[PDB]
From Swiss-Prot, chain A:
The gene is WDR5. SUPFAM superfamilies: WD40 repeat-like. It comes from the Eukaryota. Changing E290A: Strongly reduced affinity for histone H3. No effect on interaction with KMT2A. Interacts with PAXBP1; the interaction is direct and links a WDR5-containing histone methyltransferase complex to PAX7 and PAX3. Interacts with HCFC1. Component of the ATAC complex, a complex with histone acetyltransferase activity on histones H3 and H4. Component of the SET1 complex, at least composed of the catalytic subunit (SETD1A or SETD1B), WDR5, WDR82, RBBP5, ASH2L/ASH2, CXXC1/CFP1, HCFC1 and DPY30. Core component of several methyltransferase-containing complexes including MLL1/MLL, MLL2/3 (also named ASCOM complex) and MLL4/WBP7. It comes from Homo sapiens. This is WD repeat-containing protein 5. The lineage of its organism: Eukaryota, Metazoa, Chordata, Craniata, Vertebrata. Gene3D superfamilies: YVTN repeat-like/Quinoprotein amine dehydrogenase. Signal peptide: none annotated.
Curated annotation (Swiss-Prot), chain B:
The chain holds residues 12 to 380 of 538 of the full protein. The keyword Cell membrane does not apply. It comes from Homo sapiens. GO terms for molecular function: histone binding; transcription cis-regulatory region binding. Keywords: Chromatin regulator, Isopeptide bond, Nucleus, Phosphoprotein, Repeat, Transcription, Transcription regulation, Ubl conjugation, WD repeat. This is Retinoblastoma-binding protein 5. GO terms for biological process: DNA damage response; response to estrogen; transcription initiation-coupled chromatin remodeling. The modification Phosphoserine is found at S339. Ubiquitously expressed. Residues 342-351 are annotated as: Interaction with WDR5. In embryonic stem (ES) cells, plays a crucial role in the differentiation potential, particularly along the neural lineage, regulating gene induction and H3 'Lys-4' methylation at key developmental loci, including that mediated by retinoic acid. Does not affect ES cell self-renewal. Component or associated component of some histone methyltransferase complexes which regulates transcription through recruitment of those complexes to gene promoters. As part of the MLL1/MLL complex, involved in mono-, di- and trimethylation at 'Lys-4' of histone H3. It comes from the Eukaryota. Residues 319-341 are annotated as: Interaction with ASH2L. The gene is RBBP5. There is a cross-link at K118 (Glycyl lysine isopeptide (Lys-Gly) (interchain with G-Cter in SUMO2)). Changing V346E: Significant reduction in its ability to stimulate KMT2A methyltransferase activity in association with WDR5 and ASH2L.
UniProtKB/Swiss-Prot annotation, chain C:
The record marks R2 as: Important for WDR5-recognition and binding. Changing E91A: Does not affect methyltransferase activity of the enzyme alone or in complex. Changing C101 to A/S: Abolished auto-methylation. S-adenosyl-L-methionine binds at H58, R60, Y102, N125, H126, N168. This is MLL cleavage product C180. Zn(2+) binds at C128, C167, C169, C174. Changing H6Y: Increased interaction with WDR5. It comes from Homo sapiens. Changing R90A: Slightly affects methyltransferase activity of the enzyme alone, while it impairs methyltransferase activity in complex. Coiled coil: none annotated. Changing Q86L: Leads to stable interaction with ASH2L and RBBP5 in the absence of WDR5. The chain holds residues 3764 to 3969 of 3969 of the full protein. Changing R83A: Disrupts interaction with ASH2L and RBBP5 and nearly abolishes histone methyltransferase activity.
Amino acid sequence: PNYALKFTLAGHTKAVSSVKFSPNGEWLASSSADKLIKIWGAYDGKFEKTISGHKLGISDVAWSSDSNLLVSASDDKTLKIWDVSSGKCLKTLKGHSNYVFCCNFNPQSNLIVSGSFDESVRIWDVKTGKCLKTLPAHSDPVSAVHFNRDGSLIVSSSYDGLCRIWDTASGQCLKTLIDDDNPPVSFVKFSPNGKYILAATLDNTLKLWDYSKGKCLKTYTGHKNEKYCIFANFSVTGGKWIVSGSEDNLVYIWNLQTKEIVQKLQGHTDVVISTACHPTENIIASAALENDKTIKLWKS
Amino acid sequence: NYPEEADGTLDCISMALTCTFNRWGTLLAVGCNDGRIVIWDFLTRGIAKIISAHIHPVCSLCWSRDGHKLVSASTDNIVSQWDVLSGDCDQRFRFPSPILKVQYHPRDQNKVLVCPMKSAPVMLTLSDSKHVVLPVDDDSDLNVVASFDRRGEYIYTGNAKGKILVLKTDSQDLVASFRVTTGTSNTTAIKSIEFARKGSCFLINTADRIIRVYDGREILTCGRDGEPEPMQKLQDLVNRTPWKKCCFSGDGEYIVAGSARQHALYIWEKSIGNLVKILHGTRGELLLDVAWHPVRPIIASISSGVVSIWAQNQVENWSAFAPDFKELDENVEYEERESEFEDEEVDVTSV
Amino acid sequence: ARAEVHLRKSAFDMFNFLASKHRQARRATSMDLPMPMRFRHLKKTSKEAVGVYRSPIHGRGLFCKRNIDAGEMVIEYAGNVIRSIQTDKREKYYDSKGIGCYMFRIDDSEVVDATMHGNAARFINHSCEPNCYSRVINIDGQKHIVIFAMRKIYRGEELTYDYKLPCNCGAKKCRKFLN
Ligand SMILES: Nc1ncnc2c1ncn2[C@@H]1O[C@H](CSCC[C@H](N)C(=O)O)[C@@H](O)[C@H]1O
Ligand SMILES: [Zn+2]
C-alpha cells in the first residue's frame, strides 16, 4: 500500500481521453481528442510515437492482445483503425449516427464492439470492417460495454439503470440487471473470471453484483463519483485494491477487504476519468482531464 | 434447437461441391468445381481464407484430430495430407480415377483409409506411402462401403448386398457379420453407413428408402452371425422420397435427412424419431449436400453453389428484457397475499 | 465527449423497445364457425397476426403487417384479473411507482389489470375514430375481452378500439373524456 509517484508523462494538449496499459504490461500509452494518440512508455514515460490522421476528435482507443492494433472511436463517427507498430490508416469505418464514445475487444481479438451514442450497439470486423450486427440496446446512449473471459457476453451501461447482459453469438438480452432506482450506469465490466459484476452507478457508491446469484455484497464509502463516467478497476497485484478516478483531485484506490478510506493518492488538478492497472506489477495509471494533461506513474 | 425458418444464406462462392466442419464444427472447407481451399468464419458469417489448390472437383475432405491438418481427393487420385497453416502436398500416386472416400483414423492421423469407387477399401499409413488392402468376400459387388467407428476400434465394411463385415483397424478381426432383409423379398443395396458423436447409436441408409437405427454394443453382444433388429425404422410415408444424404445432430439426437428429389427436407430425432418439421424450399432447386453443426442448428445446404442456411427455434419473449413482466397464458385470477397489507469476503477473480 | 455531463438519462419505463428502427373467408374469426373454434383460433393467431412496435400516436403500439378483415377477432386483452377493490390498491401502487395503469374490465365485479400480468394488448392506443371494438364473449364459463374489428385494417395501421382526458387520437370525433 505504498504506491509512489515516479514520473510525469507530459505533452498532452487537450483532455486526456484514456490511459490504459498494453496487454504486454510494457506500454502505458494514452490519447486525447486532439487527434494525438500519444504512445508513451510504462516505466519512465519515454516517447514512442503519436497517431494522427483523423477528421474530428477521439473518444476511445482500445488495446488488442498483441499490444499493437488500436481501433479509434474517433468523434468524426468513424472507426479508424491504427497501430502501435506502424500507424497506418488501416480501415476507416463510418456508420454510427452519433458519437462513438467507447470501444472494447473480446479476448479473442476478432470483434469490434462499438458503444456509441446512437443507442444501437453495432459490431464491426477487425479484418475488413463490416457492420456485423446491430443490438437494439436501449433508449439511452452507451457509455461502457465489456466482454467476459472469452467474449460470449456483452454487459451494458445504460442511463436508465439497466445492465443487460447481452448475448454475443445469437445476440439477445439474456439477463437484465434490475433496479427500482434508475441511475445513470457509467462503467460496467465483468469480473476477470467472468462471474461477477461491478456496476458503477453514479451515487457515490460502487456496487459489486454477483452474476450467478445477482445480489450485491460489498460497497464503498467516502468517494466522489456523481457527474462523470469515472472508470473503476480491479487490482490483485498488491492487495485486493480497486483503482478508480477522482473528482476532488485524488486517485481513488481502496480495498474490497476494507470498503473504506485506507489509502489515498494525490496530485492531479482535474477530474480523473480514466484509470488502469498493470496486470502483474504495481503500476497504476492516473491521468485527469484538460486541467491536468499529465499522467502520474504511481508505483509500489 | 431444431432449425425452422429461412435465415438467408452465404452464397459468396459458386460451384460448391462438398463442405466439412472441423472437430469443433467451427470451421468450414468447401472444395468446388475448381477445388479451392475456401475457409469461413461463422459468427461473422464471413469468409476466413481462400486458397486455390487444383482444377478438379475435390470430392473427399477431412480435418484432423486437433482440427489443424487436412486431406484432399480430386479426380486425378491426388491423396495427400494437407494442412491449415500452409496446406501443402505430401503424397500422390495412382488410384482408379473415381475416388469416393478417404478417412483418418479417429485416434491417429497416421492411419488413413482410402475407399475408391469400384475397388477394395485400402488403408494407408501417413508416415510413408504404405497401403493395406482390406479383404473382400464377394469380389463381384466391388462396392463395399467402409468406415472407422467413432472411437477407432473397428472398420464396418458393408457390400452392395446388405452383408455386414466388421474388421479390426489393424488385424481384420471378424467380430461381427450379418445381413438384413425387410418385407422379405431380397436384400438391399446399402446406401451409406453412419456414426453419431455421443456413443454408438448409429444407422444404415438402404436403397429401399428406409433408414434403420442400430447400436454397436448389441452387435458385439451377438458378436458374429446374430440377428440385430433395428432400433428404429425411418422412411417416408406419403411418397417414395429417395435419399441423397442423411446426418445426425451434433450429438446424435436429432436425425435430419436430405432428399434427392424436391429440395424440401425432413427432420427426425433418434429416440422418438418423429417427423417434427418439413423444411421446405424452392422446387426448382437440386439439393446436393447437407452439413450440420454441433452446438448450433446450422443446415449447410449446397445446391449447385448455392449454400443456404436455415437456423432457428430461438423465439424471443419477455421476462429477460423486463423480468417484472409475468406473461400469463390465459386469465390468471388470484390474490397474491392472504393479507394485502453477511460480510463474506467473496473472491471476484475466482477462476 | 467526456466533459459535457448531459441530461436525458432516465426513462422510467419497465420495457425498453425504443431501438434505432422499430419497423412498424378462411379464418374462423371471420367464418360462422362456433365461438370455441374462434377462441382457440384467437390465442394461436394473435401471436402471429400482429406485433408490438413504437407508436407515434402514443408510446409503443400494435402495428399489424397484414390486411386485417372486418368484424373478425384481433387480440385478447388478458392480464391480472384482480378484484374491483384491488384496482384501487394497484392504482395507488403504480401511482407511487410510475408504471402506467391498464385496467379495462368485463363488468362491475372484477377488472382485468394489465401491469404485472399482461400481453401485447397493453400496446393498444386510443383513436376516437377507431378500427375495432370489443364484445364480452363466453368460453367454458370464463369471460374474455376480445377485440373485434370494424373494417378492412390495412398493412401498417395501428390497432385502436373504443375504451368508453385529452387523447392523442388525431380524430375529429374526439370526446376528450374517458370516465
Ligand atoms: N392514443 C393515445 N393517446 C394518448 N394516450 C393514450 C393513448 N392510448 C393509450 N393512452 C394512455 O397511455 C398509456 C400507454 S403507456 C404508453 C405505451 C407503452 N407503455 C410504451 O411507451 O412503450 C395508457 O395508460 C393509456 O391510458
Ligand atoms: Zn385523442
